[PDB]
C-alpha cells in the first residue's frame, strides 16, 4: 500500500514534466508566426515614409484625408493640425476642400478652416492630419501612422487566409 502511493507520486511528477515540455513547445511556434507577421507590419512603414517624401503624389492623398475627416465630422467650422512641412501645401488647397465638402454633403461649403499654430512630431508621425471642430473638443485622428494601426486589427483574418490558404477542419464558413 505504501508502494502504490510512493510510485504514483513519481508517475504524476514525470507526467507533469512531459506535459510542461509539450506545452512550452507550442509557444515557440506561435511566437515565430507572430514575429513573421510583425516583419511585414514593420517593413511596411518604410514605404509610407517614401510616399510622404513625394510631393507630386502626396497632395491628392492629403486632400482626400482632410475631406474624409470633415465629412465624418459634419460641422460648419474646423481646425487642422498638420506637420510643419505641410502647412504650405494645405494653404494652397483651401478652396477645393471647401467646395468638395459643400458638394459631397448637401450643405453650403465650410466657413473657415483655421490651421493650428501647433504641430506634430517630425519622427513619430509621417503625414496625415488631425481635424477637430471650432471648440476643439471632438477629434478625428487620421495620421498615416494611425490608419495602419487600425488596419492591423480588422485585417488579421484576411491576412491569414492569404498566408496559409483556407484553414482545415473548419467546414461551415
Amino acid at each position: 500500500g505504501n508502494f502504490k502511493s510512493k510510485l504514483k507520486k513519481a508517475m504524476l511528477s514525470q507526467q507533469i514534466t512531459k506535459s510542461t515540455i509539450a506545452n512550452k513547445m507550442r509557444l515557440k511556434v506561435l511566437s515565430a508566426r507572430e514575429q513573421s507577421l510583425d516583419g511585414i507590419f514593420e517593413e511596411t512603414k518604410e514605404k509610407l515614409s517614401g510616399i510622404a517624401n513625394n510631393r507630386d503624389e502626396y497632395k491628392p492623398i492629403l486632400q482626400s484625408l482632410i475631406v474624409e475627416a470633415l465629412l465624418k465630422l459634419l460641422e460648419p467650422k474646423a481646425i487642422v493640425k498638420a506637420l510643419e512641412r505641410d502647412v504650405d501645401l494645405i494653404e494652397s488647397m483651401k478652396d477645393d476642400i471647401m467646395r468638395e465638402y459643400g458638394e459631397k454633403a448637401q450643405r453650403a461649403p465650410l466657413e473657415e478652416i483655421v490651421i493650428s499654430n501647433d504641430y506634430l512630431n517630425k519622427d513619430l508621425v509621417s503625414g496625415g492630419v488631425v481635424v477637430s471642430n471650432a471648440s476643439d473638443k471632438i477629434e478625428i485622428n487620421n495620421t498615416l501612422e494611425e490608419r495602419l494601426k487600425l488596419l492591423s486589427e480588422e485585417a488579421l483574418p484576411a491576412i491569414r487566409l492569404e498566408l496559409y490558404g483556407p484553414s482545415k477542419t473548419r467546414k461551415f464558413f
Binding site: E139, I140, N141, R147, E154, A155, A158
Partner: peptide, 9 residues
C-alpha cells in the same frame, strides 16, 4: 476586412 474606418474622440 480590408477596410479602414477612423473613429472620433
Amino acid at each position: 476586412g480590408f477596410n479602414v474606418k477612423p473613429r472620433l474622440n
